[PDB]
Symmetry: D2
Subunit: 466 residues, 4 copies
């Protein structure tokens, strides 16, 4: 395990505390054995998500203070429009309040646009893997969310460079089974969050786009963690060895027609989303007509002017190679510390988190009882670190059958906010989990006490299968 020094120094700090063990037990019972329902005051190191918890730079804060809060035609909107043209070479932008707001702008528009001429009677979205919020909007509009990640992602301990790649074989098969007229869009997720933050190769993005161009299929790039994806392409593809991160980003988006990005990830923000469209003005026009009643006027889209300002700066900082090397190198440090101690993880580590394979860790719990959730609750009661589940819990139920969706991966996600915690914080996390090697065989799963029909894991209250 190698530590990479921060390419920055601390300018402002925020106090954290370790709750007593009795506090954590009472807090978990009141939270229905769901860490999502814990208050932040009962959490020490918060690994629930890397979304909106990032630490901003002084230039980001300075940009916020001078932000133009005008309702129509904010100066920061035009700075954002020129920034997207610089990075992605896309000509149209629509700001959104965060990622699921961006999808709520674009996805229904893409469905109605595909439904012209009376086609797409059984519409489907195809992705390497739809994340929970992305798949929810696909199904909330009456479509099927098809995930076709490469099989090499399911072998957790075997190394591969591109565990987030599309399964090109499955892609052509789904196109032949449903027909191009029923395929609303192909959603390229970079990095593939459900597969473990694993990257997608350039040649995979190119081949997927060329196949979609053959059938006249619209391609959207789910761009929450595109900078971390670009870093891996520079690191693992010999073709981009002497290329800048921006040069890699510029080539990635030659293989998409639009993007839906959650600026709360790689752009190093606490709030914010973005829709950008390459050249289809009709799709841009329809998406604007939906942005107004749902998010807000088309030049702020549910964001304060200061947040568009912070986004303009954060989009530049998120692509800085020295930062990406430390950020991804820190996650690699936490994974290597666990891997060297015998904890099975998704190898190699992704861009934003370490994914502990809880299939091998707690095999006595079936997947339908959420074994990864039992490990998370044990980690919290042991250390006050709060993690999140990426397995059968998050996958939810199939909207057609109403039963458990087939989960190939049962993961505990140790999500790392950007520029927030040090490698000494990582050692605390690793040493707390390593200290539970003799208690893994004792854990038992959870059963539902209150289950929401859509995105159940966020607010569900669980009961320990005691």
């Amino acid at each position: 395990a190698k530590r990479i020094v921060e390419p920055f120094r601390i300018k402002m700090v925020e106090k954290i505390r370790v709750p007593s063990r009795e506090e954590r037990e009472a807090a978990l019972k009141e939270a229905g054995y769901n860490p999502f329902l814990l208050p932040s005051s009962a959490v020490y190191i918060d690994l629930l998500t890397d979304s909106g918890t990032n630490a901003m730079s002084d230039h980001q804060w300075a940009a916020m203070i001078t932000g133009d809060e005008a309702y129509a035609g904010s100066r920061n909107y035009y700075d954002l429009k020129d920034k997207a043209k610089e990075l992605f070479n896309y000509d149209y932008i629509i700001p959104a309040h965060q990622g699921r707001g961006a999808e709520n702008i674009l996805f229904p528009v893409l469905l109605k646009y595909k439904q012209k001429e009376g086609k797409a009677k059984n519409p489907v979205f195809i992705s390497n893997f739809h994340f929970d919020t992305t798949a929810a909007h696909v199904e909330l509009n009456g479509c099927k969310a098809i995930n076709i990640v490469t099989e090499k992602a399911f072998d957790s301990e075997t190394y591969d460079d591109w565990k987030g790649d599309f399964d090109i074989k499955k892609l052509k098969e789904n196109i032949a089974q449903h027909g191009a007229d029923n395929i609303v869009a192909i959603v390229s997720t970079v990095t593939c969050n459900s597969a473990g933050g694993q990257p997608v190769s350039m040649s995979n993005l190119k081949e997927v786009y060329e196949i979609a161009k053959q059938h006249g299929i619209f391609v959207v790039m789910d761009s929450a963690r595109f900078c971390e994806n670009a870093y891996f392409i520079k690191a693992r593809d010999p073709k981009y060895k002497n290329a800048t991160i921006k040069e890699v980003i510029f080539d990635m988006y030659k293989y998409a027609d639009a993007l839906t990005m959650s600026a709360k990830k790689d752009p190093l923000l606490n709030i914010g989303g973005l829709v950008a469209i390459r050249d289809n003005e009709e799709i841009f026009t329809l998406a604007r007509q939906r942005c107004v009643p749902m998010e807000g006027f088309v030049t702020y889209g549910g964001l304060a002017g200061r947040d568009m300002a912070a986004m303009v700066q954060g989009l530049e900082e998120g692509t800085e190679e020295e930062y990406l090397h430390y950020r991804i190198g820190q996650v690699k440090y936490l994974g290597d510390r666990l891997r060297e101690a015998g904890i099975p993880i998704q190898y190699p580590t992704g861009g934003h988190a370490v994914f502990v394979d809880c299939k091998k860790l707690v095999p006595q719990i079936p997947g339908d009882q959420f074994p990864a959730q039992a490990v998370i609750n044990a980690l919290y009661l042991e250390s006050g670190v709060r993690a999140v589940e990426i397995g059968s819990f998050l996958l939810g139920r199939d909207p057609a059958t109403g039963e458990q969706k087939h989960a190939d991966m049962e993961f505990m996600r140790l999500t790392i906010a950007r520029r927030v915690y040090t490698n000494d914080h990582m050692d605390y996390i690793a040493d707390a989990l390593i200290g539970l090697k003799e208690k893994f065989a004792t854990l038992k799963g959870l059963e539902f006490e209150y289950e929401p029909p859509v995105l159940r894991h966020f607010t569900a209250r669980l009961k320990p299968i005691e």
Copy 2:
């Protein structure tokens, strides 16, 4: 015309600038003759809205700096929860990124809740007046938006205390005509924005609620400008002459079951919304289930932690009677300056804006050609002041007939942001509009160059009728 001194002093300033005449004409021609499509760099004094353009206090910025950005269980969420219990005596809250996000959470829930028990076969919403964003969500969910403001709101020059009241006769008539089973909810808009920011009396709110309870009808208080309504109740109702503003607010929300608040208005914010529910835990649970995929997790709802922190402080500052007296007095001062010169305005002035009766100002333009928009474009080219139309342009087309909704009033709204402009800015505005007396009879209407199907006035490009 009387000037009221600021109960505060200036701590931070932002430069404004007057664009040249040639700049304004070219910018308007570029904007399709729609000021919404103007950039802020081409606007001197921006009177387009009082939403999100407010100036915050030092305490509000201090609250933002220490805001908890935790994804789940933010410390500021619980502060926002205790604040709603303090102000409104409501037990449940759901933050939203702004007002239309709050209505997107609650309104479809209130429809599915009524439908589940075999009611709402032909669903309608009843309000003193639905605003353009509020009515859009009603029509998007397949309902009819019915506006029953008192007739006195149409007698613009004649003073009346409560030009925002429900027409109680029309309320009982619409209940019998449609059936209480088909009325999804009653929406009490305080203040009534479409009627000129005019207040609703306490006795009117009470009688409307009691009527709804006889028929089992849900009552939602559209609460964007609730503090300005509470001031008018204190200033004009003899029953609350010696009551605090908070006491008036506490009594106001005894006559609703839930509220949908755009915190970008009276809570003195640049972004933010809120859903608060009095005691219906079932409606609260369904609303949370919809909030998760549409806005965000239930403890931030598409808002950064700092913005919930500013909301808790702004909710307090917005209730201070000394501030409200200055704010509404500044609107009254601008209206008086125009009224002293013969400009027909909605008298008395509302809480947040001066509404110029362009029906009486430019009679030679029929309402179907947006006469108020002609006055706005003339005022902008003369002085660089951007105003917004509240008439046939904003009312749009009726969804059932596809034809122009009958507009009872053609208003130009001079919307005043809170704690931003001085009374010397007000003098510039008044002098500018007064200087267009000899050119009113020469103005002409506008045609559509591009008309959106939903919320057209935001992005429609216009053509001056030759």
Copy 3:
């Protein structure tokens, strides 16, 4: 009286309140009848000074957030050095924590420098007027403070363009009496604070410098309010009718060898000072050696890096003619309001304050009993407005005599912070003082209960003569 609109809008506010008459009476008795010993909570509108109470822009606060706090070689130091070369064409800078710190760096160096040749046996300083802090450091170093302001400054009600000019005849008479070898330096105060913030003409500055170089006398420009002086030169000197404010400034500092500036005035700061030297590198090195033990290291001078960054921005905002026209126009508006009611004031009003001639307002109080202080205490008890006296109280005792220095003027100074109060605040100030027109003849003077030896008026406790 004419109101001038702000060339900006408000972005942040700070609450002020009016304490009751009861609170003010118990506060003044507690404060030894000296308003300087009053807490700010017992003060409504604070007119004590225009120093450090200004409101900054958003660009200023942004510069602070990205400020380089480095101990040696802060990035903002070199920006501050490049700014002085732009504005003043001076080659050397030394930051100081405020203006009196800048005088403590430079003035002792000039005395020792003059004493090398065996000169300065009876050292004196010559100025149009040393302010209380400038003269104090002169007398701390064993020198006499000689003030030779134009006689027209004592002609209160009679208009004159340049009531801050040097008396050229008295300048030549003092050079011949004491000898050029005994004159350590000439201090050009712009504007002349003790004459009422009145400006010095460019030709007067040019003549004083030509006389000084004729005798080898060092010229220091007291530059606390240099921008307000530059505005008056453009307004009243026809040679600079079509010149920018920066061009006027550039010509002003052709007639000086160095400057001591309190950045808490025209550079729109809450803290900060500056020493700048034209080209004499020996003085720069000698002043650097004293800066280190007294203020701090030579690249921050007892200032935080954020404050140097705000200084670089405020120096630019202080030269904008639109702002100066509004700022000085606001002082002119308050002065005109008092003058239109018969209140004798130093006419025309200066750049930063309105000076009420209390020698004409309250004739029944001898100069040794501080008549203006009686008017201030009366004005504070009436309205809660705090003001400051510029007469025999501030002038102090003659160090060689030990008795009262003769004062030719008895001023009450209504000092206006920059971009803090509106013209409506100005109306409150005037109306309060005008309401005292019947109680002026009944006021009595003040005598000393505790007198400091150095600068008595700041911490002295008084006793009203009954």
Copy 4:
């Protein structure tokens, strides 16, 4: 070497860069081979000082935003007064712009007070060790600075609990040698900066105060690092094993009559100083009379209101034992890493810096040629880390004899700012210095090119002896 995790997380960052080798060699030759003359742009990790470079909390920045910038009676002044009464039990305070301003306020007042009855003909100050600016002010007022640190401070490698203790035998001998009437004050520096940031025991502080009150000698506590001293007392004195830090601080100041403090150290600020007096009102009044000419009015003393607000919060956070444990543990970690590699340091490590004994590192260079400075220049040219010399260079020449004062230690100080750098940054510093283990015999020494008469090390340019 044990790494101690941060009791906080990062909220804001600022970027740091590693310059190239040629840039560092170009910058060092341009800086006159004096790191004090390097621009911060040419510095990677800055170990020059721990003064004013600290990172603030979110609470501290929030306090700045609501700071009262009133000239007289700022609310933050009264908060600072109550804070000093809480922490130190002292009844009087005077804010200063920084530590050397606090000494310029109090030290000349103590000299004239001691000379009140014509005594103190040969005045002296006695301390465990006067730091450079403190001794400079002692000697600027015609006094001798007597340092009597325990001789166990001169044995670098041998551990001792209290290497900052007064040599009690030399204290009593100095009292008899000079007479109590010549001893203006005794200065207890906590921690003792010149001895390596080493602590002073509670028993030592108690005995020095008892001996002083026996002779009627005023005792001033140089309190720049009083929290770090209070931590060591709790850590090493078994008497305070179960006491809080505040209880240790409260007991420390029973053994002084006043304090001078640079708030730029333990109170975690970027600017600020403080004078506090236990109960001597006459000295307080005399100190106020000097603050006004030199620093500013007595309720701000050369500080912006926001900086007094930051000081009230910083004085609280500086006493938090969890933070002090991590802070001092981080310095111990850097020292242990160097000590484990055979590099001599002042053992044990002090509170704020690792002191590398260059007398044992480069015995080839005599102390008169500043051997530690050659090591500093070598470390910077190798890694971009800037350190400071504390040896014969810092000590200076005798203001009497004009030759260099005897230095019993030649240190290279690796000063660590508070909450700014991670333990990974320490590894960079350690590995960089360890990598020079071979070039120590190559080092060269320095000779002056320009020497200031007071505090030479700051601005002196020097020629390499090679």
